[PDB]
Ligand binder design. Sequence first.
Ligand SMILES: CN1C(=O)N[C@H]2[C@@H]3NC(=O)c4ccc(Br)n4[C@@H]3C[C@]21O
Ligand SMILES: [Mg+2]
Ligand SMILES: [Mg+2]
Ligand SMILES: [Mg+2]
Ligand SMILES: [Mg+2]
Ligand SMILES: [Mg+2]
Ligand SMILES: [Mg+2]
Ligand SMILES: [Mg+2]
Ligand SMILES: [Mg+2]
Ligand SMILES: [Mg+2]
Ligand SMILES: [Mg+2]
Ligand SMILES: [Mg+2]
Ligand SMILES: [Mg+2]
Ligand SMILES: [Mg+2]
Ligand SMILES: [Mg+2]
Ligand SMILES: [Mg+2]
Ligand SMILES: [Mg+2]
Ligand SMILES: [Mg+2]
Ligand SMILES: [Mg+2]
Ligand SMILES: [Mg+2]
Ligand SMILES: [Mg+2]
Ligand SMILES: [Mg+2]
Ligand SMILES: [Mg+2]
Ligand SMILES: [Mg+2]
Ligand SMILES: [Mg+2]
Ligand SMILES: [Mg+2]
Ligand SMILES: [Mg+2]
Ligand SMILES: [Mg+2]
Ligand SMILES: [Mg+2]
Ligand SMILES: [Mg+2]
Ligand SMILES: [Mg+2]
Ligand SMILES: [Mg+2]
Ligand SMILES: [Mg+2]
Ligand SMILES: [Mg+2]
Ligand SMILES: [Mg+2]
Ligand SMILES: [Mg+2]
Ligand SMILES: [Mg+2]
Ligand SMILES: [Mg+2]
Ligand SMILES: [Mg+2]
Ligand SMILES: [Mg+2]
Ligand SMILES: [Mg+2]
Ligand SMILES: [Mg+2]
Ligand SMILES: [Mg+2]
Ligand SMILES: [Mg+2]
Ligand SMILES: [Mg+2]
Ligand SMILES: [Mg+2]
Ligand SMILES: [Mg+2]
Ligand SMILES: [Mg+2]
Ligand SMILES: [Mg+2]
Ligand SMILES: [Mg+2]
Ligand SMILES: [Mg+2]
Ligand SMILES: [Mg+2]
Ligand SMILES: [Mg+2]
Ligand SMILES: [Mg+2]
Ligand SMILES: [Mg+2]
Ligand SMILES: [Mg+2]
Ligand SMILES: [Mg+2]
Ligand SMILES: [Mg+2]
Ligand SMILES: [Mg+2]
Ligand SMILES: [Mg+2]
Ligand SMILES: [Mg+2]
Ligand SMILES: [Mg+2]
Ligand SMILES: [Mg+2]
Ligand SMILES: [Mg+2]
Ligand SMILES: [Mg+2]
Ligand SMILES: [Mg+2]
Lengths: 96, 136, 98, 48, 170
Amino acid sequence: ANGATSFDRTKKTITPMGGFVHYGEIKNDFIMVKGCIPGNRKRIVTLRKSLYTNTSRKALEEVSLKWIDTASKFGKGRFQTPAEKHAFMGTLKKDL
Amino acid sequence: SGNGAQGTKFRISLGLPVGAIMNCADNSGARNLYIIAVKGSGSRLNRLPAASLGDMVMATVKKGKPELRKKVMPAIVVRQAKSWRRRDGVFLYFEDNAGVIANPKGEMKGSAITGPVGKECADLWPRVASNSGVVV
Amino acid sequence: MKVEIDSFSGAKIYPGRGTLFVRGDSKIFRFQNSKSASLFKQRKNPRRIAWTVLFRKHHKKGITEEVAKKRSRKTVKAQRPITGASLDLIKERRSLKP
Amino acid sequence: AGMTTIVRDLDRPGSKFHKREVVEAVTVVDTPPVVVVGVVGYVETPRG
Amino acid sequence: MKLNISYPVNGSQKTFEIDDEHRIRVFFDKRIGQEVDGEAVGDEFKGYVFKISGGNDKQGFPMKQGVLLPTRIKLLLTKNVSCYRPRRDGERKRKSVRGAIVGPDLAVLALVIVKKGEQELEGLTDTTVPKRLGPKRANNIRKFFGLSKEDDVRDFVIRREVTKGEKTYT
RNA sequence: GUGAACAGCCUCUAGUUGAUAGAAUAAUGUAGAUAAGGGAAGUCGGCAAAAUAGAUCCGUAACUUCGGGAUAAGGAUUGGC
RNA sequence: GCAGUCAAGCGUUCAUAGCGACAUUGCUUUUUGAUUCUUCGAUGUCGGCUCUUCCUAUCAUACCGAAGCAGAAUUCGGUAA
RNA sequence: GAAUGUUACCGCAAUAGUAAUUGAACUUAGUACGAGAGGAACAGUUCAUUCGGAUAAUUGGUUUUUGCGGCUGUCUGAUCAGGCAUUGCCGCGAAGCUACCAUCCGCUGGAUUAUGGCUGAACGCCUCUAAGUCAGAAUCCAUGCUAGAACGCGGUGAUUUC
RNA sequence: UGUACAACGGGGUAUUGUAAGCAGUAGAGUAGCCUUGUUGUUACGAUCUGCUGAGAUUAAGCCUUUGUUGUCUGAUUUGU
RNA sequence: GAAACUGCGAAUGGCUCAUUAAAUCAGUUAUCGUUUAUUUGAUAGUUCCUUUACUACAUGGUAUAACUGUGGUAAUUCUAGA
Ligand SMILES: CN1C(=O)N[C@H]2[C@@H]3NC(=O)c4ccc(Br)n4[C@@H]3C[C@]21O
Ligand SMILES: [Mg+2]
Ligand SMILES: [Mg+2]
Ligand SMILES: [Mg+2]
Ligand SMILES: [Mg+2]
Ligand SMILES: [Mg+2]
Ligand SMILES: [Mg+2]
Ligand SMILES: [Mg+2]
Ligand SMILES: [Mg+2]
Ligand SMILES: [Mg+2]
Ligand SMILES: [Mg+2]
Ligand SMILES: [Mg+2]
Ligand SMILES: [Mg+2]
Ligand SMILES: [Mg+2]
Ligand SMILES: [Mg+2]
Ligand SMILES: [Mg+2]
Ligand SMILES: [Mg+2]
Ligand SMILES: [Mg+2]
Ligand SMILES: [Mg+2]
Ligand SMILES: [Mg+2]
Ligand SMILES: [Mg+2]
Ligand SMILES: [Mg+2]
Ligand SMILES: [Mg+2]
Ligand SMILES: [Mg+2]
Ligand SMILES: [Mg+2]
Ligand SMILES: [Mg+2]
Ligand SMILES: [Mg+2]
Ligand SMILES: [Mg+2]
Ligand SMILES: [Mg+2]
Ligand SMILES: [Mg+2]
Ligand SMILES: [Mg+2]
Ligand SMILES: [Mg+2]
Ligand SMILES: [Mg+2]
Ligand SMILES: [Mg+2]
Ligand SMILES: [Mg+2]
Ligand SMILES: [Mg+2]
Ligand SMILES: [Mg+2]
Ligand SMILES: [Mg+2]
Ligand SMILES: [Mg+2]
Ligand SMILES: [Mg+2]
Ligand SMILES: [Mg+2]
Ligand SMILES: [Mg+2]
Ligand SMILES: [Mg+2]
Ligand SMILES: [Mg+2]
Ligand SMILES: [Mg+2]
Ligand SMILES: [Mg+2]
Ligand SMILES: [Mg+2]
Ligand SMILES: [Mg+2]
Ligand SMILES: [Mg+2]
Ligand SMILES: [Mg+2]
Ligand SMILES: [Mg+2]
Ligand SMILES: [Mg+2]
Ligand SMILES: [Mg+2]
Ligand SMILES: [Mg+2]
Ligand SMILES: [Mg+2]
Ligand SMILES: [Mg+2]
Ligand SMILES: [Mg+2]
Ligand SMILES: [Mg+2]
Ligand SMILES: [Mg+2]
Ligand SMILES: [Mg+2]
Ligand SMILES: [Mg+2]
Ligand SMILES: [Mg+2]
Ligand SMILES: [Mg+2]
Ligand SMILES: [Mg+2]
Ligand SMILES: [Mg+2]
Ligand SMILES: [Mg+2]
């Protein structure tokens, strides 16, 4: 329940359906960073402490996540959990 | 924007470069608005000044009451066509391009506004809020 | 955080996903993606498109166990006589006869 | 690893979007514990 | 949101306001006619099973059974239907209605007890309000008391005492 | 065979399979294409490109040397069985 | 084309806040001339598009000083490309 | 990319380059000032322009995924399944590439200029200046950022037997 | 010579939008025989329906893997 | 006798002269070509079941306003749950 939150509550990791495209499943501790970072997926990346203390009011804002999208990134993603997908479509030809 | 428009405006995708013609949504008699400029725009070599929903433009009237024609007057874009995106993360677009003729203060000309209106236009311009039944 | 649903397909539209269309009659149409969005603009009729919710509904597809029996009911069998009627004289008045 | 979307309520008193939800792009970086295999010292020199 | 709850056995009704959206969130995406297990509403309601009978959203608009939707739509109304009282003969009016699917927009949810929990509720299973009126017509008296029409109804009609000054009447 | 057709597209007969080759698929090109919103604001200039198009029916202005203008313009229609 | 010095005058009064006659000293080389040194066994010879860099005699943006600067607006000047 | 033993890892930083810009609204304030008409700015806040460096969650664009479906003509006796028409045509189309058509990010110290000052003689007075000195700008030098001198450099690992 | 690598197969993800085959009292209808009909029968009919959100494709720069098969010492060159 | 149900009325009135040129309208016809609340006058022994162990006729059925009580909305001759 990495991707779960106070508001979300459903137990799920951050890994999108069918995993991150081109990467994998994220089975360990991670950083989530607002917005986009330089470099591409799978690349070695350094996260460094800031060189200055910033006030700015735009920083310092303590934020709590509401909901994180766990849907598939390998297509037009619809469902979040594999449960929610069986929930909505129901029983299929293979299944039970 | 910038004159008599109370509050500020978050950036919205530009659907109307100069020369675009949009429907006129009020009862002033004006059928359409030909955009000759955009208030409070920028400058870059060869860039076309563009207008977005909520902006104030200078325009003319191509079809309309001949007393509205051959003259330049300010107007406010009430509806886009080009899909724009609000902070709440939605990508939305109207059916037609439309705006109403307005005095520099940002007060209307006619008393009514036919069709829906963007909130970004509404929040920004008080008088528009008055005459607009359907917001967004 | 409202998860919306598509006005064509019927699938849930989670935040940020898809697109929104304000028709001239000021009726709103939300799509989960370009597929429904186009198909809507193509004047396709969803009850004719096999994968829409409308379709499977109208054609009655996969509703089986939602058509079965259910138990929801209650039991009371009480006595709370007419007001101001002295319900102390309203008990011994009814054991009936027969 | 890649990216995803997040929704949170915004606290920015004065902003039109104060107290209202905003969807936001993010990235994720897989960061399993690094391990310390050595330490090097450095001295100041007129050269550097 | 506020809850307007009613015990159809006693005739008792009390309101409860519930903050903390998670607790509220049990009712979401739920229709009118579906039942709720009250463990999740709180621990005071544990073991009580509820019924969603209606309610009013913000702006107070009523719900309507059957409309589905978690929204507010406009409908043409006629005689003998909910949320419309006609002011003229064959008068119809197109009015706004709120959907029957519960949503966070609702200011008040109308609830009807089905079964009783393990804890007595302060104003409900505790107090009971007697029916306003007793039988009027012939056999209804007979069939309230099961009289097997012989027994002479006029004895079995219910009487209401009232005091006029120092003179009490029946 | 399709169709109005010696058009275009596909085949029978006959004749070919000749034009250095291999591996890749950067920039730039040459040739074929697509682009949200706007719509000539580009430019000497709509250069280019795009739009139109068959047939049946309906409808068709100025003006004219009465012969025209004229497919004027503007419309609806088209499969299969 | 641009900037000086003298200060009769303009500026209600007051030469020089801001201007400035008669004169006079200069700078500049995106004006035009004047000349004809260089290229006539050829340095592609309008304009635009485009891209870079440089100049400051600064239109704007930074900080100042002055006023016939109350405020607002504006004008003169400095450091400034 | 030869050669400064070989090979590998981690670093230093000469020198060179450098970057951010401009506006508006709220508030200050119908305040200061003014007879009035009119009417500011400093701090605080929210956005915006031009610029730059990324980036593809989302949305849009692209389609030889020739992925799926549809359609015309013809050819394989028919069916199934297919071929040919310079990618035959059409709808949808993942992946990638990509867009102020999408989203994110764009640092803070010092020394100065003009200028306004302190102290202060020359010149018993007076003077920001002569000696000495304070404050100071979109400037400057750093910080930061990008290269890394292939003839600038440091630390560390392993260093061959037929 | 091992949470080794590879080629397939499985599962997830994703795209299209309901496969072939078979069946039906679906179907504007149409023929042929007689026992000339108190659903008379054998068939044929664009299309519809059910099995069937099926079938197909899915890494070629998707995710994954207790299954299967196979691979794991050729060449050159370097010294203070 | 409030309220409310029920029944009736709200289609008369009053106003205006916009359209309307064989339309309206006028006089004169027609319904053996139709509908008509009301008023007025006439008009109804028949209703059940293979027809002795029999059907409530000394009269069969609930479901609602008003009311009570819990509610929503800035807001109306709004109204919801019980
Ligand atoms: C381009 N050229 C060319 O072909 N010959 C040269 C000529 N030299 C000149 O003196 C002259 C006078 C007028 C002109 Br034009 N030019 C020409 C310039 C030049 O370089
Ligand atoms: Mg991905
Ligand atoms: Mg994706
Ligand atoms: Mg230009
Ligand atoms: Mg004209
Ligand atoms: Mg109004
Ligand atoms: Mg598309
Ligand atoms: Mg797309
Ligand atoms: Mg050749
Ligand atoms: Mg060739
Ligand atoms: Mg070749
Ligand atoms: Mg190319
Ligand atoms: Mg295309
Ligand atoms: Mg275009
Ligand atoms: Mg156009
Ligand atoms: Mg034009
Ligand atoms: Mg032009
Ligand atoms: Mg021209
Ligand atoms: Mg043209
Ligand atoms: Mg051309
Ligand atoms: Mg086109
Ligand atoms: Mg012509
Ligand atoms: Mg036809
Ligand atoms: Mg003189
Ligand atoms: Mg003076
Ligand atoms: Mg004078
Ligand atoms: Mg000049
Ligand atoms: Mg001359
Ligand atoms: Mg010369
Ligand atoms: Mg020469
Ligand atoms: Mg020459
Ligand atoms: Mg030459
Ligand atoms: Mg040359
Ligand atoms: Mg030449
Ligand atoms: Mg260029
Ligand atoms: Mg003075
Ligand atoms: Mg100065
Ligand atoms: Mg420069
Ligand atoms: Mg310089
Ligand atoms: Mg050697
Ligand atoms: Mg104010
Ligand atoms: Mg004054
Ligand atoms: Mg700039
Ligand atoms: Mg940019
Ligand atoms: Mg195909
Ligand atoms: Mg065919
Ligand atoms: Mg077959
Ligand atoms: Mg062939
Ligand atoms: Mg050919
Ligand atoms: Mg794409
Ligand atoms: Mg710093
Ligand atoms: Mg002093
Ligand atoms: Mg000084
Ligand atoms: Mg000095
Ligand atoms: Mg001195
Ligand atoms: Mg700066
Ligand atoms: Mg320094
Ligand atoms: Mg920096
Ligand atoms: Mg080096
Ligand atoms: Mg070294
Ligand atoms: Mg192998
Ligand atoms: Mg199907
Ligand atoms: Mg490649
Ligand atoms: Mg297997
Ligand atoms: Mg009348
Ligand atoms: Mg009933």
